[PDB]
Amino acid sequence: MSQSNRELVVDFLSYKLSQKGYSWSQPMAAVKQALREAGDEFELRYRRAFSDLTSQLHITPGTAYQSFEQVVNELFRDGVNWGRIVAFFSFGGALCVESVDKEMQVLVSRIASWMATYLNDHLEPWIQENGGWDTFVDLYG
């Protein structure tokens, strides 16, 4: 429970400081906000091409990570750019919405873990040589 209790402390203090007119911003806050905004814009700019990407995979309780990695590896087959990273997040979002639509809310945490794995293995190493998430925020935030 130590990690949970640390996150509870930071949430309460953030809330209290904001109530008194002070902003105590957490490290990834601007990255989270920029990615939310970038995904919304991506889904409104690229409806047809995004539909073609999301049509490549339908997750069920039986699906293995390899099925997800194969489809996402096609997105990145000839390398990474920030537009493809946004597409990756939007793609995972769409798989989660499909899951909940089909009464398989239980798959959302699995897709989350798959996306984290695929960040760890493929994307983080590119991000660390291309200006970090802070470059993303300056480009897209």
Partner: peptide, 10 residues
């Protein structure tokens, strides 16, 4: 290589 419309901006 450009394969998707989101690649154009990069």
């Amino acid at each position: 290589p450009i394969r998707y419309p989101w690649d154009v901006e990069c």
